[PDB]
Every structure is written in C-alpha cells, then in structure tokens.
Amino acid sequence: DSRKTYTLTDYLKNTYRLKLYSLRWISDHEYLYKQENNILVFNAEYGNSSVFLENSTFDEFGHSINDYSISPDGQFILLEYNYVKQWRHSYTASYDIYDLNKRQLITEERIPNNTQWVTWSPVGHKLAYVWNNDIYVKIEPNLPSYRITWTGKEDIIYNGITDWVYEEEVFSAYSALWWSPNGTFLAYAQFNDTEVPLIEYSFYSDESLQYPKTVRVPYPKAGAVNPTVKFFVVNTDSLSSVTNATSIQITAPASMLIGDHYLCDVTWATQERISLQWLRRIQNYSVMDICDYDESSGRWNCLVARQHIEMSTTGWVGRFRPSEPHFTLDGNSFYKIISNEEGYRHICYFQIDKKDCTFITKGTWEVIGIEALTSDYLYYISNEYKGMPGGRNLYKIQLSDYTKVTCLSCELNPERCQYYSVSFSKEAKYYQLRCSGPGLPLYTLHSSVNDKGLRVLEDNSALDKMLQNVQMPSKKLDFIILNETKFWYQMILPPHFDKSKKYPLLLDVYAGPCSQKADTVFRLNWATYLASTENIIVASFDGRGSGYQGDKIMHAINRRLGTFEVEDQIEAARQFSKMGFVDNKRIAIWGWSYGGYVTSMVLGSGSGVFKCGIAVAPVSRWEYYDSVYTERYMGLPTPEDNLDHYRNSTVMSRAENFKQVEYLLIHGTADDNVHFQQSAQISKALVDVGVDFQAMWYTDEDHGIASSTAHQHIYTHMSHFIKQCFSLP
Amino acid sequence: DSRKTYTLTDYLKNTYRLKLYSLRWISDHEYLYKQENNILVFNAEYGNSSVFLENSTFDEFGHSINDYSISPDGQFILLEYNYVKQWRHSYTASYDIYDLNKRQLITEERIPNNTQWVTWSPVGHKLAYVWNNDIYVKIEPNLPSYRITWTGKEDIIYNGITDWVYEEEVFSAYSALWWSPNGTFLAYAQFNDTEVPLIEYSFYSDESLQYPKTVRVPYPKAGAVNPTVKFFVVNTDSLSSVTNATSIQITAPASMLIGDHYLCDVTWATQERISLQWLRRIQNYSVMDICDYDESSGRWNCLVARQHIEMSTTGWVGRFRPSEPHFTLDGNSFYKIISNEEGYRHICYFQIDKKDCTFITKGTWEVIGIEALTSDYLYYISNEYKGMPGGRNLYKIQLSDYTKVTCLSCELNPERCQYYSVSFSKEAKYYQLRCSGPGLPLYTLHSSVNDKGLRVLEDNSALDKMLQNVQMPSKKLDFIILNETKFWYQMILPPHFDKSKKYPLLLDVYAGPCSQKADTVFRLNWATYLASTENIIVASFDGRGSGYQGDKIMHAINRRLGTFEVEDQIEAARQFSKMGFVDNKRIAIWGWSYGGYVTSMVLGSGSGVFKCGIAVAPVSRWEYYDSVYTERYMGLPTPEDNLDHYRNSTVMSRAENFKQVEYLLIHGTADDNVHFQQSAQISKALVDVGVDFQAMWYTDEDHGIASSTAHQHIYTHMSHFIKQCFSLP
Ligand SMILES: *[C@@H]1O[C@H](CO)[C@@H](O)[C@H](O)[C@H]1NC(C)=O
Ligand SMILES: *[C@@H]1O[C@H](CO)[C@@H](O)[C@H](O)[C@H]1NC(C)=O
Ligand SMILES: *[C@@H]1O[C@H](CO)[C@@H](O)[C@H](O)[C@H]1NC(C)=O
Ligand SMILES: *[C@@H]1O[C@H](CO)[C@@H](O)[C@H](O)[C@H]1NC(C)=O
Ligand SMILES: *[C@@H]1O[C@H](CO)[C@@H](O)[C@H](O)[C@H]1NC(C)=O
Ligand SMILES: *[C@@H]1O[C@H](CO)[C@@H](O)[C@H](O)[C@H]1NC(C)=O
Ligand SMILES: *[C@@H]1O[C@H](CO)[C@@H](O)[C@H](O)[C@H]1NC(C)=O
Ligand SMILES: *[C@@H]1O[C@H](CO)[C@@H](O)[C@H](O)[C@H]1NC(C)=O
Ligand SMILES: *[C@@H]1O[C@H](CO)[C@@H](O)[C@H](O)[C@H]1NC(C)=O
Ligand SMILES: *[C@@H]1O[C@H](CO)[C@@H](O)[C@H](O)[C@H]1NC(C)=O
C-alpha cells in the first residue's frame, strides 16, 4: 500500500476537515445559513434561497465581527466583536446593532463595552443584556435601556449571569435570563457568592509583564460554602423611565429552603406559567414548581398541589441534573425524561394537577432527549435500535397510541448512519437530521407530514474522495461480559489489521459518571494517527458508572468514585491482553480530566497490566474539585457522611505503586476548572516516595490546553512519550 | 581495577561523609564543641576539656532544641526551638533561657514565641530581639523587656530585621541591629516597603489543604520601587531610667539623599563611634560616614572631614558591595579592602580624617578578606600563592613594617592544602586553620604568640581509608590563554583517565559576576559520580566577569550580562575539544541560577557546540530579577539608561534556536528568589515556536530544591537525562 497514512501533522493541521451544515431555523418554513461568508435564507420545502445579508455589508466596519445574531423578526442584527473569553461558556464583547430596514448601524444608545451577555426576545426584537453584573432591557435597539437591577457587584452578586460553578456544572451557560414566550416577562436568577472561597492562581501573561498577576475566582470546592440563589420575574411591557422596574420574586419550595440547594432548571410553559426545578445540595431529591401569573395580584403563585417531586434511592437525580420538561400547547401537561422502576430513563407524561405521571416508553434502553412535540406526535432520540447504547436515532411516538412508535432514521442508511442528532423548524414542519457515524457525516432535510426525505444538505463527498488516498484505520464496536452484564468497548484498529500479529495497545480513558467512550461516532483525532501511522490499537471501555444503559450500571459508583470504574478499565485491559492480537508487554493508558484521574488511579493500582500512562489535567483528590459535580457523586466530605471515601480515593495515597510504570503528568498552570493544585500534589507525592516520572506544565493554558501552539505541543510531546514507551528494544 | 566506583546512591545517601570540626570561641582561650550530643569546652593551649553541658540536661524539655547560644559572660544559654525557615537567612523560633549557674530554666518574662531574631549584647548578657517587626530589649533575662519601636507592620515596616531584598542582596543576613562594643548602644535599620510591588505565587502545602495559599512578598524587581531605609541608635543604658528611650536618627549624606540609595554596611569603631556606608541605587558610588556621640546633646554627628568616598568608573563598588572596615582599637584609623589603580583589590590603611589612604599590600593577586587585627599584626587571606586565583592562604603583615609579610598556611602541607579558611579566638591568641582542598579537609589549631601548631583537630583518616577502596575521579586545575589573558578552568576527570580516548563532556556552569567555578576545593558531589561511574568529564570555566583576578576581568560584563560570560563558556568548550580527549559529539552544559541562565543562553546561541543542556531555577529576563543584584550590573531598565540591553539579553528571544538541542527545564514552584515566572516564560516561548523539550517542576520547593526527597529526585532525574543524551549506539 503506497498511500500515505494519517499522520500527526494531518491531525494537528486539520488537513482533512469534516464539512458541516450549521443552519438556524428562523420560522417553521425557513432557516439561515452562512454560505461563503454572507447569510442566506432557505425555504425548506423547495431548497431555493436568497441572500439575507451580503458578506460585504460591513467591509468598512473597522472591527472584526466575532459572531452575529439576527433579531427574531429579521429586522435587526446584533454584531458581536471585541471577543474576550472567560470560562467555558462566559466571555465579554462589544456589540453594535445594525438596522436591516434603514440599512444603517444604530449609533444611539449603544450596548456598553464589556457586556457580559445579551439576548433578543423570543419574538420581535427586544434586548436584555448584562453589564457589570446587572440587567438592562431595551424595547427598541435605538432607545435608552431600563436598568432592571442595581445589586450587581463583581465576584459577589450576579444578576442574569451565572457564577463559576453554576455556569459549568448546572446551566452549562453564562446566561441566567429566560424570556417568556412572547417576550412579555423576563425571568432571571440571582447568585450571591459572598462567602464562597476564592481559588487563587498565577497568570504570567506576555513576557513584558514584570509581575505575574494573581487570578482570583469564587470557586466552591467539595464541602465549601456554595453560592446562594434567588429567582425573579419582571414585566418588560410595563417599564418606565421615571420609577425603577419592579421584580417579583418566586421563592424556592420549603423542602428546599431547609438547607443548601440549587436552582437547576427554568422553563416557561406558556405566556403566564413558568416551571422551575430546585435541587438539594444532597442531589438525590428535586422538586418542580409551576408558577402562574396572577394578573390581578400581579404576583406569581405556584400552587403546592402542582409540585412534582423527583428523587432517586440509588444515586443522584437525572444524568447530570433533572431533565427539562416539555409542555404542551395549552401548558396543562408535559413530558419529562425520568428514570423508571427498572432504572432506565424514559419519557413520562405529566398533568400539572395530577401527581402520577405515565410512562409512554419502556424497555432496556434509554431516551437521550425529547426533540419535538406536536398535538399528534412527540419526537425523540434513543439508543433502542439494535440494542446498541452507542447508537442514536430519531423516533416519534403517537400520543393517542403509545404502541405505535416509528423510527425515522434507523433505516435511512444503516451501514453509514447509526448516530443522529436532529433539528426541527419552529412548528416541527421540518427537521434536519445529522448523522455522525460510523461513516462520514451526512446532513439531510425532511418534512414531518409524510416523513419524506427532501434533500441532502452535505454528504462530505470531497473528504471522502481524499480519504480514499489515505490508509485510514477502522473502528470496532463490540462487548464483553462481566458478571452476567454486558459492557461495550470500541477499538480503533490500524490499517490492514492482521489478527495474527500482535499490536501494542493504548487505552483511551474517561469513564466519568454517565460517560460513553464506546460509540458509533466517526472521529478524526490523535487516536486516528496512532492507529494509522504507529500501528497502535486505541481502545476504550464503558464500565460501571458509564451512561445510557440504566442506573444499575450508572449508579454502580454512587458515593464510591475511584473504585468500580477504575477496576473495570483494568479488567478491560486484562481481557484485551488475553486476545491474540494484543502485545501484553505494550499496553498504555491515558485520559484528560476525569480520564486523567482514572488513568492515574489505574497506574497506581499495582495491577502490572500497564507499562506506561499519560494523565492530562487529572483530578487527584475529590475535595479539590468543585462542589456541584463532586458532591453529586460523593456526597459531603464530612465524618458523618462520606469523608472516609473522599480520603481513600486520592491519587496521592498510591504513589509507591508507581515505581514500576512510566508516568507522564501534564497540566496547565491557568486551569480554572481542575486546578494545577491537583497535579502539584500528585507530583509531590511521587517525589516523597522517590518515584521518577515525566512532567510538563503549560504556562497560562487552561483545562482545554487548546491554544494553537499549546495544542500542537502537548500532542507532540505525548506522542514522543507513547512512542518511546512502545519502542521494541 | 575491581574497586567499586562512587555512585549516585553514594552521593544521594551520603555514604562517604566529610568529618568537620565546628568550634565556637567563647573567649581568647577556650572554645565549645560537641563530641557526641553534649557540649564540651576545650582549653586551646593544652587541648584538655570537660563537659560544658551534658546531653542529659534537656531531656524533659518537651521540645527539640535546634540550636543554642551562650551569653558573652557565659552565665546564660539561649535555647532555640520551634524553628521555621523562611528565606536564605531569616526564620522564626521559640527560645528559653537557661541559667547555667543556678542550673535552672527561666519561666518569667519569656521571649515571645514567633520571634524573628534575637541576639546577646557583645558583652554581659543583655538581650535584643525582634517580634512582630518591632525591637525589644531585656537588660536581664528574667526581667520585663523594653519596647524600642512601635512602627512594626507585617510586610511594610521592618525594625531591626531586613526585608527580602536587603536580606538576600545587601546584608546576607536577616538582622539589622548592631550592638555597640560594650553593649551600651543598640543601633538598627528601618525598612519601609509601603510602595514595593509584591511577588505572588501559590504554595500548596500538605495534601490536606483544600485551597492553596497565596504567598505574597514585598520584592522589588529591576527598576521597580525599592524599599527606603532609615538608621537609628538607642542608648540601652537609659531604658530602666527612662520611660521611652529615644532613638536617635543618623540621616544619610546629602549625596545619597538626592536619590534612591541603600544602607550597605554598619560597623562600630569604638564605644561612641559608629561608621556607616551608603550606596546609591546606581551602585558605582558609596560614601562612608564616621559618626561620634555628642554627650552634651545625646546626638550623633558625622563630620564631613571624616566622610570617605569609594566609587568606580569601570563597574560597581566592591565585589558584591563596599567592603567592611576594620578599625584599630582607638578607632582613629581603619583597614579596608578596595580596588587599586590596577584594579586589584588590596588592603588600604585609613586615618579617619584623611581622604587619602595607603595600600599596605599590592601585586597581581587579591586579598579575599581581613580576618583579624591586633596592635601589631593584621591577618588576611589572599590568593597570592603561586599565582593561583583559585587558591586561598592565611597571611600576616607587620603593622610596623609592611615588607614583613608571613604566610602562615602556605607550607603546612602544600600538596594537600591550598584553599584555607581561619577562625581566631576572641583576641587572636589562637586560630583554627581550615583546609578544604585539594585533599580531604584538614582542621588544625595554632597559637599566635609563635605561630606554632598546637595540634590536629580533624584529618579525615576514616574517610581517606574508605575512599581508598573506591575509584575516585581526579581534578585538574589549570588555565588556557585568550588575548594574552590567563583564564582558569578545572576538570573532574574519570578514573584511569586516558588522553587517548574521547570522553563525553559536561560543562558545569555558573559564571555570574565575580564568580569562581575553578578552584582548589575538594568536593563530593554530582560531578564526582558523573566522572567516577559514568566516565564523564565535568568541566567549569571562569571567563570574563569571574572574580578574584582584578577588575579588568570582573568588570568586563559591566552593563552587559548575557554576553562575554556566555561566549567565553562556549569558547571554553571549543578549547577543551581542541585538547583532543573530548567527544565533540557528546558535549552537554548545565547550571543553577545564573548557571541556568547562561546554560539557556548558550543553548540558544546556535553555536551547534552543545548537544543538550540542563537549566535549574534559571533567570530568563533580567527585568524579572531583584533590583539590588540586577541593577548592580545592568543599571536601570529605562530608555535613558540600559533598557535596550535588558530587552536584548533574555532567554525567550532565542527560542527558535533550541530546536538544535535537547533541553531539560526544572524549577521549584515556591521559589521566592528566582520566581517560577522566569521558567514559565521560557517554556511558553518554546511552546510558541514549536520546540519540544523536557520540563520538571518541584511543588513547594524553593530556590535550593534542598528538601531531602526533592534533592534525590531532581539529581536522579537529571542523571537519566544526561545518560540519555550521551547514550551512544
Ligand atoms: C423560494 O422561492 C419561492 C417561489 O418559488 C419564493 O416565494 C420564496 O421567497 C423563495 N425563498 C427564498 C428565501 O429565496
Ligand atoms: C404576551 O402575553 C401577555 C400576557 O398573557 C399579554 O398581555 C401580551 O399582550 C402578549 N403579547 C403578545 C403580543 O402576544
Ligand atoms: C449576599 O449574601 C450576604 C450573606 O452572605 C448578605 O449579607 C448580602 O446582603 C447578600 N447580598 C445581597 C444584597 O443580596
Ligand atoms: C432605583 O432603584 C434602586 C434599587 O432597586 C435604587 O438603588 C436607586 O436609587 C433607584 N433610583 C431610581 C432610578 O429611581
Ligand atoms: C439521599 O442520600 C442520602 C445520603 O446517602 C441518604 O441518606 C438519603 O436517604 C437519600 N435520599 C433518599 C431517601 O433517596
Ligand atoms: C585544662 O587544665 C587546666 C589546668 O589549669 C584547667 O584549669 C582547665 O579547666 C582544663 N581544661 C578544661 C576546660 O577542662
Ligand atoms: C560603655 O561605653 C559607654 C560610653 O562610652 C560608657 O559610658 C560605659 O561606662 C561603658 N560600659 C562599660 C562596659 O563600662
Ligand atoms: C512608609 O512610607 C509611607 C510612604 O511611602 C509613609 O506614608 C509611612 O509613614 C512610612 N512609614 C514609616 C516611615 O513609619
Ligand atoms: C515612644 O516614642 C515613640 C516615638 O515618639 C512613640 O511613637 C511611642 O508611642 C512611644 N511609646 C510609648 C510607650 O509612649
Ligand atoms: C556611575 O554609573 C553611571 C552609569 O554608567 C555613569 O553615567 C556615571 O558617570 C558613573 N559614575 C562613575 C563614578 O563612574
């Protein structure tokens, strides 16, 4: 075979790009798409389009626009620039509104610089933005803004935006604003991190900064004081320049106010009904409140009889947090994915007045998410097809008869497509299907009335042609049994794989709670190069604690992090080493974050199964990690709760067992998520027991070590390491 | 040869130990010494002794006594415990005075815990100590102490003790209080670091600390705001008679007050005469003031007729600072080492009220230091013998006839002793000579009346015996000539060294201003093993900028750090290569501190001479290092001074060149001296240009990385690296 293999440079340089097709539904019949660089509008039914905005309309803007956002009515466009990243979702920027009618950019009453967040109303073109931790509203882009809040105070009071832990572990967003459907009310949360300790670390910046700066971020570690939260709703239709806006507060339920708790979900049901979910610090009990607007009193009332309790006796509630409800048109009922009697996550139908929900789906498989709802059907994605937890398809169930379930993606192209995600238009008149594996990504448009296939948006013909000139590796998805249970794994096999030969093996690991490293998704990554060029087999295993297979597996590691998930990887390796094509003398292991944790716990387990391992930004001791994520699985690190296990699941305690393995520890000094502190403590422990090891720190890089240069440098360094570790002497 | 070799474990485990003989003169006739664990007192004249304090006395003290101190009058002993290190010289501890006579421990008016510094008066048993940055005095060990200052303030005002930069760069000591000869007066310095920027960095501490601590230290980097200082003197004899004894200030001379300056030397001449030396921020001009106590005003006056100036046109003043003066008993004249008309430092005789001194020694060699002065003789140490800059010997000159100079150590044992050190009794009646090379250390006692050897105190017979059964390396000390100038170097050659073979060479480098890596001292270090076991030739070279050879060589680097000292090391390598017994392919380089900086600079020069190099705690950009030391050689980093060379002599600007070598970067994270920032900026520059290298950080280790575990870990790590870089298929 004279074809080139997939090299490290291809991965690092993106020599082979997967074409995408990111669209944005602006109605039930049209969607926006970024062609060349200008914006076009498409009619889903025919495929014809028109330019919605010339890629040259802002040639002399005098600023590079980071991103845009058209108002719902297509009347305005919010140009974002001066982008400056903060954590995973947060960031600041400067904004400018450009009237699409007058074809002139508004120069009056502009959004302030260093705006923390902005958002159009769902309908029309109102604006709500957060500045210096306060909320403002603009009924018209060129009119003054109303200041909705006055308590904003950096690192203390957040209004409309999340603090560090809420953004990363609860909302996966920086936004803490929620417009009501027609945009009348603006619901927002308020966080107070007054007593939350600050994580502190150095930032060196450019070489010209003489003194390094100390970054201080309110971050609650396991057991520390968490931020507190309040909810509010304000009417934007009745705001005045004279008096200040009045926000009506909706206090949490009594079962929540008896101790620490979190706001974990906000969802409008109708124009005057809002539902909220609260979660106790001990995350196995949550309650939903449904609040109706009292047009007379002007206040919001949430009738007890409308409260819905959700709790688990075997673990935490929900996959990472209680699922979102999907209300019906009238808002009188709703569907919500909850764990069932047998511990499998399915869709349950709820009446806001009745307390017993009804399951409309069942079986030893799970519903990943509810994607769309009509009076006749509910569309969702699950891993039911062929009973493969790693696969995903679009299904729809008839609401009048649950026995009638129809898969809409299963048979489209079975050999190429086994993992879809979907995108429906405003009224579910149309939907885009996105297939991401096992073969190359495929995007298609469909109509709901007859579930007919309209057309192909992107099939990646190009990439496919070039990939043909390459010796691409293959992927094997399968399972092994452990104690009657079925656990899945996948192997990235080198080209021209020969079962008579023996290859070294690299166990790519994550294994966090509800994780899944064994799926049918097609990926171009480091593993791709290792198998294509170094002829290294890259495997992954989903053991206990893994997700999408029911709580018996997922909850297996409840209050016991660092046990079964770590054991199962070892047992997984142990079994792969027993296979004919694996060289038991050359088996490595690596992970990032939780994978780093697991990778380290495995190397210090004393199993003798692994020769070397690489841990990138690993967690080393749970009391070092954040409260919301750690406590969810571990509980509180108090003597009367689970402190003992907190102290027994550290990497440090296993230092000596590293004497017989080659270890490479990497971490960014500016990691605000998994603090460098965790790696510094791992290293000190190894030094304490005299174990040599490899290390690499990245100045000013954070948890993702994603800067262009750092990204290439870390993968290059790790590659040298794995290569040296597998070098046949 | 079947004898074992000196191994790494040998060096790391202290298998072959150098015996020592540390005595403490308590008078002009006897000294204290620890045979086992008890303290013994020896009669120097006959060598007979007895137990001053037997190891049984403090068994039930309930504390580990770290160190002890006897009051001048021998009536009390100051016990030190609860010792907690801080910087290079500073620390806090607890103390308990023991009443040697009543053989009882005092429990009244005890010195407070967390005392920063404590010292007896030169005579009697008065005590002076610093607590919470203020000065206190105890006339009697059991009586209440008097408070001398009320301005103390953590990290802001220091009375009696130095700040970070004064301790490390100006006084090499933590204390800043000077008792007068008979103890009547107590003088002290006061430092104000109100506007001095702070260096900040994390300290992780034990695994049990949830949130790392941020260590903050007032530390002025190059060109930043320096601490200001003030001098005072209090009459301790008036304390019991006065309510609040007043501290009299002796202001600096106007020639210093015009700008930033430093108090760099305090020396009492008589009971009522004290001398002060001030140095301008631009360290090429110092002034000495000799101040006398005016009894009728209780004030201190410094007559201009006694003000002496000491500048330099080719560099800074002194080796590292203006030298200390040595006054004759009447205080009317003094001796002092200063650079002469040829640039060689020699002893000059001064008459306090005469601006022209007389040199009492001369030639092309230098006086290392004045050790003792009697009415008839002045004893000094120089490197005049055989013209060896790396040699050291005790000399005696006749005050009445300068042509009368006797060397007291030159011939005692010429083959085995070339590097001497001395310790005279309280009145120079006896002196211990301490030989440290080229043979095993030798300690001997002598009598001044006739310069006769009283006896040998330690000769290291045992060790010599042990070392006999080991293939120890040999050390060659010689010179090469460049531009008619002699430049010394030393080589640790492996056993059975053969000039017919080619040996890999490791260049041990420091090369800071006034440094000296080539000398006659005998050592058992990492190099010993590299030559003995790994058969590696470890060489060091003193090029331009090195010391003890005149200002022509030492001031060659004036305002140009990162140049000649760097090139000369490289030119050194070539020369050794020209010597025919070096593998031109296996030449490595390594250094600590300035050593690390020069190593990096060399490695990034592109000479293609060095294959690999190791830099530990290196300086990388002079603007990151402290004022006093940096500015002393580089001036100020301003456009109108020397900013251009500051920005042009950094390691970072040479990143692209490290693509030609194997680099190992190592740094302690709690390094208060050479901040981690320095290596953090290097690594970042390398990553920014796609250079692969090896790094290693030591959690919570300071600039010395001397903790027991970290010490073994780093050398073990560096050993693998060197052996890898020199591996030869
Ligand atoms: C698509 O074509 C129809 C007529 O065939 C037209 O009415 C519609 O506006 C077009 N859509 C776009 C956005 O070009
Ligand atoms: C939005 O709903 C509110 C409350 O039901 C109503 O008063 C308002 O007029 C509605 N706005 C529109 C245009 O639907
Ligand atoms: C934030 O919480 C603190 C208590 O920790 C409270 O005193 C303060 O008033 C709160 N801030 C506001 C104004 O909500
Ligand atoms: C507006 O209300 C805030 C508190 O909500 C108060 O601090 C401020 O003084 C008020 N001023 C105005 C705009 O009336
Ligand atoms: C939630 O977890 C706690 C701690 O393990 C447990 O005591 C409690 O019963 C759980 N909640 C329930 C009843 O499911
Ligand atoms: C040595 O002998 C002398 C004889 O006068 C005696 O006084 C002295 O104490 C002895 N040395 C010691 C300290 O034991
Ligand atoms: C110390 O010197 C002072 C000042 O000259 C003098 O008054 C005092 O008596 C001396 N102290 C002693 C030890 O006698
Ligand atoms: C220290 O200096 C500051 C100004 O730099 C001054 O305000 C303060 O009084 C000084 N402290 C002293 C000398 O006691
Ligand atoms: C002693 O004098 C100093 C300086 O005048 C003064 O600041 C301090 O308060 C005084 N202490 C007492 C005990 O009065
Ligand atoms: C002291 O150093 C500065 C900077 O080089 C220089 O301009 C000045 O003339 C020097 N003075 C002496 C004593 O040479």
In whole angstroms, give the CA distance from residue B656 to residue A314. Answer: 57
CA distances in angstroms from A508 to A537, A615, A634, B626, listed in the order given = 10, 11, 24, 46
In whole angstroms, give the CA distance from residue A216 to residue A202. Answer: 9
From the CB of residue B85, how many other CB atoms can be counted at a distance below 10 Å? 11
User: In this complex, which of B202, B680, B717 lies closest to A204 when CB atoms are compared?
Assistant: B680
User: Which of residues B445, B471, B497 is at a domain's end?
Assistant: B471
Token pair in block for residue B346:
């020699």
In whole angstroms, give the CA distance from residue B163 to residue A610. Answer: 51
CB contact under 8 A, A695 and B696: yes
Token pair in block for residue B536:
């590696």
According to DSSP, the residues that pair with A103 across neighbouring strands are none
Burial A164-178 (b: 16+ CB within 10 A, else e): bbbbbbbbebbbbbb
Domain that holds residue B412: 2-471
Q: Say if CB B127 and CB B115 are below 8 A apart.
A: no
DSSP conformation class of B34: E
Rounded to 10°, the helix B594-603/B564-578 angle is 70
In whole angstroms, give the CA distance from residue A566 to residue A597. Answer: 9
Closest C-alpha among B282, B291, B194 to residue B252: B291
Closest C-alpha among A23, A52, A20 to residue A38: A52
Kindly provide the residue ranges of all beta strands, DSSP E only, lying in A70-180, ordered along the sequence.
Answer: 76-85, 91-99, 104-105, 115-120, 127-131, 134-138, 146-147, 157-159, 177-179
Query: B51 CA distance to ligand 6 centroid (A)?
Result: 11
Q: Where are the alpha helices (DSSP H) in A536-626?
A: 551-554, 564-576, 594-603
CB contact under 8 A, B210 and A623: yes
Which single residue is written with the structure tokens 């042009």? Answer: B648
One-letter amino acid for residue A114 of the chain: N
* CB of B151 shorter than 6 A to ligand 8: yes
User: Which of residues B419, B450, B471 is at a domain's end?
Assistant: B471
Element (H, E) at B293: strand B285-294
Neighboring chain A residues of B720 at a CB cutoff of 8 Å:
692
* CB of B204 shorter than 6 A to ligand 9: no
In whole angstroms, give the CA distance from residue A286 to residue A227. Answer: 18
Omega prior to B197 cis, within 30 of 0: no
Rounded to 5 degrees, φ, ψ at A78 are -100, 110
| Whether residues A676 and A531 fall in one domain | yes
| Whether residues A427 and A498 fall in one domain | no
3-state secondary structure of A210: coil
* CB of B311 shorter than 6 A to ligand 10: yes
The number of the ligand 9 atom at minimal distance from the alpha carbon of B246 is 2
* CB of B131 shorter than 6 A to ligand 10: no
- The β-bridge relationship of strands B127-131 and B134-138 is antiparallel
In whole angstroms, give the CA distance from residue B481 to residue B568. Answer: 12
Kindly provide the residue ranges of all beta strands, DSSP E only, lying in B524-571, ordered along the sequence.
Answer: 537-541
| Whether residues A263 and A277 fall in one domain | yes
| Whether residues B280 and B132 fall in one domain | yes
Token pair in block for residue B185:
């007066």
Element (H, E) at B480: strand B474-482
Nearest CA to ligand 8 atom 10: B192
3-state secondary structure of B81: strand
Q: Say if CB A472 and CB A495 are below 8 A apart.
A: yes
The number of the ligand 6 atom at minimal distance from the alpha carbon of B41 is 13
DSSP conformation class of A237: G
In whole angstroms, give the CA distance from residue B368 to residue A657. Answer: 52
In whole angstroms, give the CA distance from residue A344 to residue A324. Answer: 17
CATH number of the domain to which B21 belongs: 2.140.10.30
Q: Say if CB B95 and CB B118 are below 8 A apart.
A: yes
- The β-bridge relationship of strands A65-67 and A49-53 is unpaired
- For residues B214, B215, B220 and B223, what is the CA-based torsion angle, rounded to 10 degrees? -30
In whole angstroms, give the CA distance from residue A561 to residue A223. Answer: 16
CATH number of the domain to which A591 belongs: 3.40.50.1820
Q: What is the dihedral sign for C-alpha B157, B162, B163, B169?
A: positive
Of all residues in chain A, the one with the smallest CA distance to B624 is A210
| Whether residues A448 and A532 fall in one domain | no
3-state secondary structure of B239: coil
Please enumerate, as own/partner, the contacts of A354-358 that have beta carbons within 8 Å and a separation of 24 or more. A355/A308, A357/A308
In whole angstroms, give the CA distance from residue A16 to residue A529. Answer: 12
Q: Say if CB A187 and CB A159 are below 8 A apart.
A: no
Omega prior to B438 cis, within 30 of 0: yes
DSSP conformation class of A167: I
Token pair in block for residue B121:
């008066």
Q: Say if CB B511 and CB B517 are below 8 A apart.
A: yes
In whole angstroms, give the CA distance from residue B382 to residue B393. Answer: 6
**Mutation target vs A (from B208, B211, B675; most A CBs, 10 A cutoff):** B211
Furthest C-alpha separation in chain A? 83
Q: DSSP letters of B310-370? A: EE-SSS-SSSSSPPPPEE-TTSSEEEEEEE-TTS-EEEEEEETT-S--EES--SSS-EEEE
SS3 content of chain A, % helix, strand, coil (to 5): 15, 35, 45
Please enumerate, as own/partner, the contacts of A154-158 that have beta carbons within 8 Å and a separation of 24 or more. A155/A193, A155/A198, A155/A216, A155/A217, A155/A218, A156/A192, A156/A193, A156/A194, A157/A133, A157/A190, A157/A191, A157/A192, A157/A194, A158/A133, A158/A190, A158/A191, A158/A192, A158/A193
| Whether residues A446 and A589 fall in one domain | no
Q: Say if CB B371 and CB B424 are below 8 A apart.
A: yes
Contacts of A695 (CB under 8 A, 6+ apart): A664, A665, A666, A683, B695, B696, B697
Closest C-alpha among B87, B74, B75 to residue B31: B74
Token pair in block for residue A652:
């440090």
3-state secondary structure of B547: coil
A234 half-sphere exposure, CB direction, 13 A CA radius: 22
Token pair in block for residue A546:
């893994």
| Whether residues B453 and B499 fall in one domain | no
**Catalytic residue list of B:** 593, 671, 703
Closest C-alpha among A556, A705, A679, A554 to residue A625: A679
Nearest CA to ligand 4 atom 6: A150
3-state secondary structure of A686: helix
In whole angstroms, give the CA distance from residue B523 to residue B516. Answer: 15
CB contact under 8 A, B200 and A212: yes
Token pair in block for residue B259:
């700008």
Closest C-alpha among A334, A206, A311 to residue A256: A311
In whole angstroms, give the CA distance from residue B569 to residue B556. Answer: 14
Ramachandran sector of residue B588 (left: φ over 0; alpha: ψ -120 to 50; beta: rest): beta
Q: DSSP letters of A579-602? A: STTEEEEEEEEEEETHHHHHHHHH
Q: Where are the alpha helices (DSSP H) in B549-651?
A: 551-554, 564-578, 594-603, 627-634, 643-648
Q: Say if CB A198 and CB A217 are below 8 A apart.
A: yes
In whole angstroms, give the CA distance from residue A559 to residue A635. Answer: 6
Q: Say if CB B116 and CB B149 are below 8 A apart.
A: no
User: Which of residues B429, B450, B471 is at a domain's end?
Assistant: B471
Of all residues in chain B, the one with the smallest CA distance to A696 is B695
Element (H, E) at A480: strand A474-482
Contacts of B85 (CB under 8 A, 6+ apart): B91
- The β-bridge relationship of strands B582-592 and B612-616 is parallel
In whole angstroms, give the CA distance from residue B343 to residue B323. Answer: 15
CA distances in angstroms from B512 to A108, A467, B330, B430, B478, listed in the order given = 62, 57, 39, 36, 20
* Three-point CA angle B150, B155, B161, nearest 5°: 65
3-state secondary structure of A255: helix
Burial B20-36 (b: 16+ CB within 10 A, else e): ebebebbeeebbbbeee
Q: Say if CB A268 and CB A187 are below 8 A apart.
A: yes
CA distances in angstroms from B704 to B134, B202, B291, B667, listed in the order given = 30, 17, 40, 10
Question: Roughly how many angstroms between the first and final C-alpha of chain B, as a whole number?
Answer: 25
CA distances in angstroms from B40 to B26, B52, B446, listed in the order given = 12, 5, 19
Element (H, E) at B299: strand B299-302
Q: Where are the alpha helices (DSSP H) in A77-216?
A: 164-165
| Whether residues A464 and A492 fall in one domain | no
* CB of A244 shorter than 6 A to ligand 4: yes
* Three-point CA angle B182, B188, B192, nearest 5°: 175
DSSP conformation class of A169: I
Furthest C-alpha separation in chain B? 85
Please enumerate, as own/partner, the contacts of A449-454 that have beta carbons within 8 Å and a separation of 24 or more. A451/A396, A451/A406, A451/A408, A453/A412, A454/A44, A454/A45, A454/A47, A454/A430
In whole angstroms, give the CA distance from residue A531 to residue A505. Answer: 10
Residue in A593, A620, A649, A719 annotated catalytic:
A593
Say whether A671 is catalytic: yes
Q: Say if CB B657 and CB A244 are below 8 A apart.
A: no
In whole angstroms, give the CA distance from residue B199 to residue B219. Answer: 6
According to DSSP, the residues that pair with A213 across neighbouring strands are A203
| Whether residues A246 and A279 fall in one domain | yes
Query: B259 CA distance to ligand 6 centroid (A)?
Result: 58
In whole angstroms, give the CA distance from residue B172 to residue B192. Answer: 18
Neighboring chain A residues of B683 at a CB cutoff of 8 Å:
697-699
CA-derived radius of gyration, chain A: 26
* CB of B272 shorter than 6 A to ligand 7: yes
In whole angstroms, give the CA distance from residue B336 to residue A362. Answer: 96
Q: Where are the alpha helices (DSSP H) in A375-492?
A: 461-467
| Whether residues A392 and A289 fall in one domain | yes
Q: Where are the alpha helices (DSSP H) in A592-701?
A: 594-603, 627-634, 643-648, 676-688
From the CB of residue A307, how many other CB atoms can be counted at a distance below 10 Å? 16
Q: Where are the alpha helices (DSSP H) in A585-663?
A: 594-603, 627-634, 643-648
Q: Say if CB A215 and CB A201 are below 8 A apart.
A: yes
| Whether residues B381 and B489 fall in one domain | no
Residue A136 burial (C-beta neighbours within 10 Å; 0-12, 13-18, 19+): buried
Q: Where are the alpha helices (DSSP H) in B161-206?
A: 164-165
Rounded to 10°, the helix A594-603/A564-576 angle is 70
Q: Say if CB A294 and CB A301 are below 8 A apart.
A: yes
Overall number of domains in chain B? 2
| Whether residues A225 and A275 fall in one domain | yes
**Mutation target vs A (from B210, B653, B666; most A CBs, 10 A cutoff):** B210
CA-derived radius of gyration, chain B: 26
